[PDB]
Amino acid sequence: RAQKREQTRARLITSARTLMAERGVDNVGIAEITEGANIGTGTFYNYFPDREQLLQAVAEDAFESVGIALDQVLTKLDDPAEVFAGSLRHLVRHSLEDRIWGGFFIQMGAAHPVLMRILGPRARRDLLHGLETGRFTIEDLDLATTCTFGSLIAAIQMALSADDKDQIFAAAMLRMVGVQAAEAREIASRPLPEIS
C-alpha cells in the first residue's frame, strides 16, 4: 500500500538521522539504516531511488528544525539587520557544533538546493523586510538570497577545516546587503539570543 511506504520513508529518515548523528553522515550505510527502521536491506530502494534523496530528507529535517526555532526567537528583534545577522550566526555555530551538520556542508553537493528549499523563503522574507524599512540596499532579492547561502557553505567549509567566525561572516553578509562597513561589525557582535 501507499500508507506503508509513507511510514517506512518516515522511519528510514528517523533511522538515518539517529545513526548519522552518532557516527557522521559519511560513516553510515543503508544496511544499518534499514535495520534501524526494521526492514530488509534489499528493500531500501523501494522507498528511495538512491542514497542522495535520503540524505537530502535528513538535511531538510535538520535545517527546518532550526528555521522554525529562528522564526520563534530572532524575528522578535526590531532591527531587520539583527534578525538576518543573528540567523546567520546561529547557522554557523550549529555547523561547527553538530557532527551531522558539518557533514552536510562537506559531503553534500546538494547542500545549496536543500538550504534554498527550506531556509531560502525565510531568508528572503527577512531580507525583504530590511529592504522595505530602508535598512538594506538590494538590487535583486533572489540573487541576495542565493548568494547568502552560497557564501554560507563556503564559509562553513573553511571554518570546518581550521573565535567569532560567525560574527565576521554575518558582518560580510550585512555589508553585502547595504549596511555601512563599520556598522555591520557592531551589529554582528550584539548578544545572540538563545536558540535552544
Add this chain to the structure above:
Amino acid sequence: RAQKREQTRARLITSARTLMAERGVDNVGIAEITEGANIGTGTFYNYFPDREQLLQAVAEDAFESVGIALDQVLTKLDDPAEVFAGSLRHLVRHSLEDRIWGGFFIQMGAAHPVLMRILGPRARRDLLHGLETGRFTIEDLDLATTCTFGSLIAAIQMALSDDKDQIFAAAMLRMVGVQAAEAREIASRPLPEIS
C-alpha cells in the same frame, strides 16, 4: 619512459576540451575523449583514476586562461574596486556565453575547489590591494575570497535557469565595503575587452 604517460594526459585534456566545447560537458564520454587522443577506451584509466579528475583539469585550463588574460588588463586600471568588479563580470559573461563553462557550474561539484586553486590567489591579490588602498573593508581576506566564488557559483547557476554580470559584481563590491550607491556605478563602467 613515463614521459609518454605525461604526453597522453595532455592529449586527453586537449581532447576533452575540444569535444566538450562543441557538445557540452555532459554529452562527452571516455570513449569519445580517448578516441580524440588516439588511445583505446579502456586505457583511459591508466592516465586518470576517474572522469572527474579530467573534468577538473579541463576546468583548470579554462579558468587559468581567463585568469592570465585578466592579469594583463584589468590589473592596469587604477580603481581596485573596478579591477575586482570587472574581473567578476568577465567570469559571469563567460559562464553565460560559453557552452563548456556553463557545464562546469551545473555539472561539477568541484567547481568551488577548482576556482579556489586557480583564480583564488588572483582574487585575493586584488582584494588585498583594495584593502591596502582603503577602498575595501575586509576583516578576513580568505573568507572574502572564498565567499566571492561561493556566490559566483550560486549566481551563475541561477542565471542559467540582461546585465546580470553588473548586478552580481555590485553585490560583491558591497560585500567588501563599497558604498552601496557607488557600487552599481563601478560595476557598470565600460568593460575592457579581455581578448
